[PDB]
Amino acid sequence: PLFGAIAGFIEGGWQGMVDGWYGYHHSNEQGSGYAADKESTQKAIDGVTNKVNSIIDKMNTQFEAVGREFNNLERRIENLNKKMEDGFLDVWTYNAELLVLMENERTLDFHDSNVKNLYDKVRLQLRDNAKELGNGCFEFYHKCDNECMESVRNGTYDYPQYSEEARLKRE
């Protein structure tokens, strides 16, 4: 202005970071950039376009109303035709609108679960070498520069490399 990340413990979005849908924001002594996590954004985009294309594909065989004419002594058949065409249009209108509603909530929950899964991926990598600040941040306990920033953003974070300074800094 289901999952608890988007509009959850992460309070709001980031206007500066425009490269992807989800990403990072590092703030060390060497600078402060707003990077984007690829292979999560691309997976989300692929899933979203696949979902949209399936919604287009499943609705190709709808009902097409044709014009049939009847005379004044064919009013029951005219009423039957009107009710058939209107009932099929109502059925497909309900199908389209209700499918839009469900897939909209599913898309929002999918984005939320993607953000929470990225959060959990970073949490499972840093382990105790960091500190969950509660808003989606991990204040590092050792000296972490760009070289370990890119490994956190990669998926190749090396836990045994950094454990001496964290214990000393704690009280």
Binding site: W14, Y24, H25, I55, L108, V115, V122, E139
Partner: protein, 32 residues
């Protein structure tokens, strides 16, 4: 040395509807 995780935004006024809430503002939406 923070590595905060978040998501993308604009100032867009694109609005969608879900089952449990209407007037949902979204970053990107596709009118169909």
């Amino acid at each position: 040395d923070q590595i905060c995780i978040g998501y993308h935004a604009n100032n867009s006024t694109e609005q969608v509807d879900t089952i449990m809430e209407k007037n949902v503002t979204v970053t990107h939406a596709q009118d169909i």
